[PDB]
Write a protein that binds this ligand. Structure first.
Ligand SMILES: CN(c1ncnc2[nH]ccc12)[C@H]1C[C@@H](NS(C)(=O)=O)C1
Length: 278
């Protein structure tokens, strides 16, 4: 009762590959809408993500629904619940009006809960950005993609990633950029950046990529990571968004301590934000 027949998954539109499908075995279009993750070779990677998501059960983590086999039973698809409001990246610009600071801080708490739960299971997300934070409702958010998530080996503080794959470098901590080492503290750094996005209502002009590119200047490509490391070494950071209170920025800056050991924890973040609400 967690297997989806590929012929029954009717594609609607791309979500991010991740596609919106309607699983409709009765053929009367009454079937339920679902998010489907497939390959655009790296079947072993998607199988790892499936094992990860099936093992996550939390209010602030997108629900695993099942798996769809691509014949001759040689391919796999990840089936997830579909949240129509989409990611913060698409939702926040559309609702700058109803979403105040209180609501943004509740989202920050929820992301931190989802991430702390992820941390307790010994995983590093390595891709925490607003595009990966889904809106269940105006009161609830969920971490919605685990495509770069890795399990930290027992008795180790981090996972080392040595591959030819792409990385969200404008969300990465110094240790990730310099040594390819990913700690729970590196996810804390990425949360800080995600929180910046959320506070700027995911305005494209104020995105971490747009701001850092304006700081770094004209840059290839192959030199982006070095220029970014240098900027972070000098102590430069994403500026406090307009009308962002000191208390929130101070928490945001604690996610951005150059050394991983000097950063705050997700639990200290939960408590910090919760103390600001009402
Ligand atoms: C937007 N989105 C989703 N939207 C609605 N309902 C969903 N259920 C699950 C995912 C999902 C996912 C595509 C992922 N983002 S990406 C391509 O940058 O990795 C997040």
């Amino acid at each position: 009762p967690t297997h989806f027949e590929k012929r029954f998954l009717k594609r609607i539109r791309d979500l991010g590959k991740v596609e919106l499908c309607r699983y409709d075995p009765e053929g009367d279009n009454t079937g339920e809408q679902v998010a489907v993750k497939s390959l655009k070779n790296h079947i072993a990677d998607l199988k790892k993500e499936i094992e990860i998501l099936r093992n996550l059960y939390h209010e602030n983590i997108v629900k695993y629904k099942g798996i769809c086999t691509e014949d001759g039973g040689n391919g796999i698809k990840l089936i997830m619940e579909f949240l129509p409001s989409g990611s913060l990246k698409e939702y926040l610009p559309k609702n700058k009006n109803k979403i105040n600071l209180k609501q943004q801080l509740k989202y920050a708490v929820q992301i931190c809960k989802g991430m702390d739960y992820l941390g307790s299971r010994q995983y590093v997300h390595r891709d925490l950005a607003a595009r990966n934070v889904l809106v269940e409702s105006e009161h609830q958010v969920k971490i919605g993609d685990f495509g770069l998530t890795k399990a930290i080996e027992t008795d180790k503080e981090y996972y080392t990633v040595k591959d030819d794959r792409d990385s969200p470098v404008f969300w990465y901590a110094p240790e990730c950029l310099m040594q390819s080492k990913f700690y729970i503290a590196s996810d804390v750094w990425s949360f800080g950046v995600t929180l910046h996005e959320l506070l700027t209502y995911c305005d494209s002009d104020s995105s971490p990529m747009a701001l850092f590119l304006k700081m770094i200047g004209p840059t290839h490509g192959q030199m982006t990571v070095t220029r970014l490391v240098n900027t972070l070494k000098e102590g430069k950071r994403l500026p406090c968004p307009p009308n962002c209170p000191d208390e929130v920025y101070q928490l945001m800056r604690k996610c951005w301590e150059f050394q991983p050991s000097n950063r705050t924890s997700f639990q200290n973040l939960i408590e910090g934000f919760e103390a600001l609400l009402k």
